[PDB]
Amino acid sequence: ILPSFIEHSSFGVKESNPYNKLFEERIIFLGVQVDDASANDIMAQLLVLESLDPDRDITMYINSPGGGFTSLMAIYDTMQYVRADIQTVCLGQAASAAAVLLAAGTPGKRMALPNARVLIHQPSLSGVIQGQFSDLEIQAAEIERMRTLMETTLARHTGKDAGVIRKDTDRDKILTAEEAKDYGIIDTVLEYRKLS
């Protein structure tokens, strides 16, 4: 049960939800919905926020168990397409494909919480895998294309040679929030801003 809350001003009274409130603050929250179907929602949200105000940063919060490669590349291109800077925060985890989206934010603006976990994994075989005739020649070739894109895409955002990314990707390397900055995914790890 996500509770609603009421906010008011001399204009009137507005009932709203968390998440709707975060969107008003230009925060896109990428959670467990990592399906191609949700990739479309993230793209719709990025396009809406750019339309509402092209010069204001969009903050994307990432807490997700990866997802399909093809549709998370769709998000990647929208993120790079949009005029406004996109800053990213890793909460919880950014597994596999989501680690690319984390790295994809504007440099200087990739962030993580201290116990955040970033996992680099090879792209899975999914989505349109309906029965290509020579699956071992075609799906195998498509997988090499997908591995190449993930390695290339991380190299462009982490500063590591794509060959290095491959060696780590092939071994399911898991980074801590601090290791992720030394690896080039995170620019900073957030301090806990407690008043006591």
């Binding site: 090879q122 792209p123 899975s124 075989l125 005739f133 020579s134 699956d135 071992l136 020649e137 799906q139 195998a140 070739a141 997988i143 090499e144 997908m146 591995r147 092939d170």
Partner: protein, 178 residues
Amino acid sequence: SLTDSVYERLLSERIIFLGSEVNDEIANRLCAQILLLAAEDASKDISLYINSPGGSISAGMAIYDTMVLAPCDIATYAMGMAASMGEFLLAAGTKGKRYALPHARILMHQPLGGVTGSAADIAIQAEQFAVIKKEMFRLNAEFTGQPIERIEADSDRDRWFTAAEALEYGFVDHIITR
């Protein structure tokens, strides 16, 4: 089981069937039957009857090496379908003893292998497949007496041969009529 009873009686007549799948389970069953018949009496021929769509390329090679290993001639018969590894094993019988029945259909083609595992594994399965497939083509060229280029031109396409065409091509030495 009537089915198993009939096959045991035929095994004693030195007759082996490859009637389905050509997967690892089938390859282990035939390798065991070929080794058994050779062990019982290597002075006599073994007749292998093929009616199979084919299967894993590595299963077909296990059967093939066992056929070669056994110190006895192996006659092969296309009694129906001989596709992919079924064709390979047909063509792989002793020269002069490769037969097809008149309505047999032979498909020289490749197994498609199949894709499993992580991207790291798939990338290897594809390489191992490419290597085994190259050997499958090399051996088909030796079995049929064709240029390797012709084998590839026909093998990467779904090209069916009628029993008569299969003889002309070199897969089969004789068509058996009565």
